[PDB]
């Protein structure tokens with residue numbers, strides 16, 4: 001009934017935010033392992049849900065164009081001012097990525113080379129709940145599969161928003177919905193495997209042990225180290241997952257997730273080995289050590305630099 005807008009099709013309905021290609025490349029940010037809720041339905045047109053609404057996003061060399069689908073039986077209008085603010089905060093556009101790129105570059109030549117080809121990789125400020133349960137799905141997984149699991153989980157447990165072409169859009173579930181006695185069984189049906197148990201258990205744990213989603217808000221203002229430790233008490237959440245959530249949803253720019261990719265990057269590209277470890281390969285200690293290494297080199301926005309390299313290590 002209703003269709004995925006392009007900018008050519010329905011230019012009336014779009015609005016714009018002044019934003020150079022160099023501060024944000026949508027195609028590098030939206031499907032490079034931060035959010036799993038965005039897809040390029042038509043070329044250069046990214047559609048996804050954001051806080052119980054659907055958006056299509058596209059950009060020129062100096063403009064970010066965006067349009068909103070309210071969902072309900074609505075008078076299709078342009079994005080409001082508040083909705084444009086919501087998108088501004090989402091891309092943390094107050095932060096100048098140009099100055100961060102040069103600041104990291106001045107101590108790190110490897111970064112300088114990569115950053116040539118990979119500009120406009122910045123961090124989304126994601127909802128905590130959505131980031132938590134998406135990253136619980138990330139264990140022993142690739143982006144594409146995580147994307148699939150998260151989509152079905154939202155269709156199965158989350159409120160229906162709107163349909164566009166053959167795609168139905170659902171909001172992220174509340175904790176209560178994931179915590180119930182049939183939730184693990186349903187989630188296995190949806191292909192999550194062992195992650196089904198961690199999803200239900202962490203949903204149940206945040207409700208009963210931590211008092212629901214205001215807890216995640218507390219962790220947003222809590223210092224990084226405290227947030228990381230508290231996340232790590234949850235079923236299915238270790239250092240990597242906890243660091244991804246810290247970086248991506250709890251405003252801890254210094255959080256450096258250490259997975260197989262950044263372990264490999266460190267060794268291959270930086271010649272780093274664990275010093276204070278005698279054991280040669282990965283471990284909790286060595287991984288924590290590697291995180292410290294990157295903070296020391298890049299500074300309090302080490303997490304963001306790390307995202308530039310992670311994103312670049314996907315594209316051959």
Ligand SMILES: Cc1nc2[nH]c(N)nc(=S)c2[nH]1
Pocket residue numbers: 032033034138143244257258259261262306307310
């Ligand atoms: C899905 C995903 N896994 C990740 N691991 C690391 N180290 N960095 C990022 S940004 C990431 N994203």
Ligand code: NI
Pocket residue numbers: 267273
């Ligand atoms: Ni070596």
